[PDB]
Amino acid sequence: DFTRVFTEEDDLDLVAQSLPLVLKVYEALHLQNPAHRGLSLAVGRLYIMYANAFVQTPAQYLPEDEFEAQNEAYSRARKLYLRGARYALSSLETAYPGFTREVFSGDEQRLHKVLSRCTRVDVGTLYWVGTGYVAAFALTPLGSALPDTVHAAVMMLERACDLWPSYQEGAVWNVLTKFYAAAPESFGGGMEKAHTAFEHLTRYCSAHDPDHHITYADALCIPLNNRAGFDEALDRALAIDPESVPHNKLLVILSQKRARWLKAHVQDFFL
Amino acid sequence: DFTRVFTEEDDLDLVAQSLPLVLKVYEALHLQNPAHRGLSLAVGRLYIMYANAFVQTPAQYLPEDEFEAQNEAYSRARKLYLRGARYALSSLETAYPGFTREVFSGDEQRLHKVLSRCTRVDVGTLYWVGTGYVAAFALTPLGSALPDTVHAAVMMLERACDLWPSYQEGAVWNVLTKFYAAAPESFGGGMEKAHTAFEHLTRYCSAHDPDHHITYADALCIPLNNRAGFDEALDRALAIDPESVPHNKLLVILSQKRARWLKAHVQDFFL
Amino acid sequence: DFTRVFTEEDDLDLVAQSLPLVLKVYEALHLQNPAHRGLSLAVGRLYIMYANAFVQTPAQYLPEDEFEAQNEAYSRARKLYLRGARYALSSLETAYPGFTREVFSGDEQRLHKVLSRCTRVDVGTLYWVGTGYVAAFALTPLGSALPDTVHAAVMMLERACDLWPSYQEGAVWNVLTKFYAAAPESFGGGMEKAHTAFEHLTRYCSAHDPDHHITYADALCIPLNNRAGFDEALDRALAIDPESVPHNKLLVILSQKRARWLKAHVQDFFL
């Protein structure tokens, strides 16, 4: 209802400047009604999307010399991802008391047993919690990360896949592709895994979606030194007309800014 | 009620930072109640005022070398004017189904017939729609403009004049003065027209209003190389005490910033 | 309820960007219900806290060469303090009609008589009004200040002390310490007064509070050239763990930024 005015927006600045109080209002509603699962999820998702689009992403477009401000913005995004993930996780905690202790126990059997309690109704929540933690990890120094948190997040994502492969046009497979391709094999990564996750994504994703093209270029083409594929994929991301998309015009605009940047910086990624 | 806290404000930054979510809320209310004419108009007017005061105007105070950011801000204002004009136009469309097809038909007889259906009740709407389009045109490259849209906008403004000459202390005459003075005579402009429109404005405008002084200096004095009149007029705009005005202190503050800038840049405009 | 999401925040930017519309909404509620004392106070306090944390403080962290922007931001904070003080003062005016004429009469007997009408219920209001005026004075050129306004403000603060010494963990004594230490003895200042006010503060303040440490360093150590004490005090301010505080995490974060700056600039203050 109210989200349409944000998701169909083409003016980034209007969104960036209005989203903060919105986050604050949802946050307050959530704390006033901690057993409302919808509110838990909503506010969690909001922090994670804000963290990406309006904290992390602008930091990425900063110049080499201002790395200090970059690092500080990355640390800021990291904290917001985690706040977002923890807010969404309270939807699972409300539905299954003790969920948080189990899921982060480091005990594989307890992790698996608690994830087996989840149903299709929990898929949205699994997706956002797992995504929040994976997005935080991507900005976490590989030395001071928390393998058990990371492992739990991915297992939540993998559980959502089992439950509901097609969810949000394959959005889960997208986050998994990125995780596997970028993650050290000590933390569960691997390119074979990344490719299979991407194969599932292509079954469900929209032709109007630039993100699966960008994921192909960024997560898969770069590590494999496939500059040809990188270029084609981004040309496909950029061929999409934001005015023609059925919804999420705002996210398409954001993704196309990112693909434009990747193209401009191609020389950084290949030899 | 709530508008008083914005219109009597003297702190631009507080307004600039709070207006975006307000725009978003009105916008959402409008889409949730598309037959509410008041909401259509309100949100339209809001976008147009925001576009001017907080997008276009700050761009104008940028330095020569940052023309790129200037051009991008101008394109941004242009899109906001048009969104604003189109929102207000839905008030006319609600009142007279098919209004949009007629008014933009390019057929003078259909244009005139549909405008003849308008009454004094429609004057606010005519004014804002026409203003939005004229403000967009002012930022539109003379080569890629749309004569029929422009012509329809001015005819709406001229119809408001016929209906209600004195509306908002002659505000319509103000926009017309600016259009005629700045518009190529192929697009309906002309200085004789501009002067007559200004003569009507002086009949209705307030002594506490800086805008009619600025319009005289900017639209009329500059093209005619009347530096003497330019200076006097702006001195009159600046003699107004914002603390003494009965209302719209905020707009007076904005206009006086503009007159101060014009004075500082006088050498740009005369020889 | 809603204030918790602001006061426990650790992200300054989210607060800074969301507070403006909040100020505007409270302001509108206040004008719509001018006899609501709670609303008068709330909006007053809000302007004063915003003025300090998000106008004055950032100006202070600007570089030497940008003194112009600094001076303009200081003038902006000054006006906001005064708007805030005047909003809170309307709570007293509602409770005791004619309060404003009396309290600013310049007649000591009228000032004292009206302050004698105040009770413990009025302490919050006295504190905020007095603080607003003292904070404005601190940014007012010593030559164009208003001794009677300043004197009335301090007398309001001193009356709150008499009524309720322990109020908000000694917050009144904190503002008085700063006033006395910084104020010319023609305007009522004096270091002996400042020290006694600080002694009262230590009786009531929290170990989790960085502000009393900063006040000791800044108001007392600097004028007395006690660099040793300055350093210890700020080390104490910085030893506090924001994650451990029972409340006002946001203010602790703000104060610790200030103590860090003081330490970095120690050479400015001692020889």
Curated annotation (Swiss-Prot), chains A, B, C:
This is Uncharacterized protein TP_0956.
